[PDB]
Ligand binder design. Structure first.
Ligand code: X6C
Lengths: 138, 87, 103
């Protein structure tokens, strides 16, 4: 339902990591399967060969936290010369930001040892996932 | 114009009314001008107020957005406050 | 350029913003609108240093690099009771508990 179009029309793109995270570029293949591409260190860029109508999303490489590309969730290369893909942090909610910090400090096996409400333990275990973000997205 | 948010330990935080209405819980508590937080200590509530300013500044902005910092020592309590305030 | 501040006195903290080109006196006029005390009954400080009215916030050390929305700069505030100014006193915020064993 969310898949790349097999246009076969080349499109040069600059993946510009304007975030403090290690970025995981994810291509949605012709069947809609997420395909990971080499990671981008913070502050760096890459000149990549893509195609018109192809679908990309960007995540934090270690945690899968969602990132923005040109202020939206999805990037679609258009007609060229190179298209800029400006990858940035979203303004996360305070709750999501706290969950990210707690997940970075506590091993998942130990979430149940934290003195918090059961509903927060469930929020901690409900890690960001590309599959969950894709379904849906309608 | 401004509203007063009082922490469990009695610290008074004066913030723009619009910045405070960023929280649905606060809007409900307001509808003084003053809100008392029995369970929210000052080291947590000061960070909540910094979040409001950060959110109002960086929302619908094309500028590079910096990370919102949270010291490990405040993380658990801030998570409980953010959960209650729907922040 | 906007500068983000915490104006602090005793157990009071005001979160506000101002222009880097705005003056110390103009900040006192903001405090007056909130705390209902005229500028002549106020003293503003950067750390232990008394700030002069005619100086801009930028000249006082409040810049876009040091007075950020997510990390605001502190301005100390002292009130004149009758004819004498009280000493600068800012109550610290509460202390976080010890980091739990699994943190
Ligand atoms: C089917 C195909 O050739 N694709 C799908 C996408 O449109 C990208 C394109 C592709 O694989 N191009 C080569 C390529 C190699 C490395 C990268 C790369 C390297 N670091 C991050 O991304 C990106 C594109």
């Amino acid at each position: 339902v969310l898949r790349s179009v097999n246009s076969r029309e080349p499109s040069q793109v600059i993946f510009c990591n304007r975030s403090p995270r290690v970025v995981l570029p994810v291509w949605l293949n012709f069947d809609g399967e997420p395909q990971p591409y080499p990671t981008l260190p913070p502050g760096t860029g890459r000149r990549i060969h893509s195609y018109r109508g192809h679908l990309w999303l960007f995540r934090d490489a270690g945690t899968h936290d969602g990132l923005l590309v040109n202020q939206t969730e999805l990037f679609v290369p258009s007609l060229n010369q190179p298209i800029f893909a400006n990858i940035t942090l979203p303004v996360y909610t305070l709750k999501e930001r706290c969950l990210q910090v707690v997940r970075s400090l506590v091993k998942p096996e130990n979430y149940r040892r934290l003195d918090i409400v059961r509903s927060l333990y469930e929020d901690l275990e409900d890690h960001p996932n590309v599959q969950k973000d894709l379904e849906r997205l309608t | 114009m401004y509203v007063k948010l009082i922490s469990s330990d009695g610290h008074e935080f004066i913030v723009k009314r619009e910045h405070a209405l960023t929280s649905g819980t606060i809007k409900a508590m307001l509808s003084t001008n003053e809100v008392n937080f029995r369970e929210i200590p000052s080291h947590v509530l000061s960070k909540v107020c910094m979040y409001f300013t950060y959110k109002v500044r960086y929302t619908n902005s094309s500028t590079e957005i910096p990370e919102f910092p949270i010291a490990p020592e405040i993380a658990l309590e801030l998570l409980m406050a953010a959960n209650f305030l729907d922040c | 350029m906007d500068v983000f501040l915490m104006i602090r006195r005793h157990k009071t903290t005001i979160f506000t913003d101002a222009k880097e080109s705005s003056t110390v006196f103009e900040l006192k006029r903001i405090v007056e609108g909130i705390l209902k005390r005229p500028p002549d009954e106020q003293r503003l400080y950067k750390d232990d240093q008394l700030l002069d009215d005619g100086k801009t916030l930028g000249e006082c050390g409040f810049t876009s690099q040091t007075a950020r929305p997510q990390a605001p700069a502190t301005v100390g505030l002292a009130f004149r009771a009758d004819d004498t100014f009280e000493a600068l006193c800012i109550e610290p915020f509460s202390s976080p508990p010890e980091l739990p064993d699994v943190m």
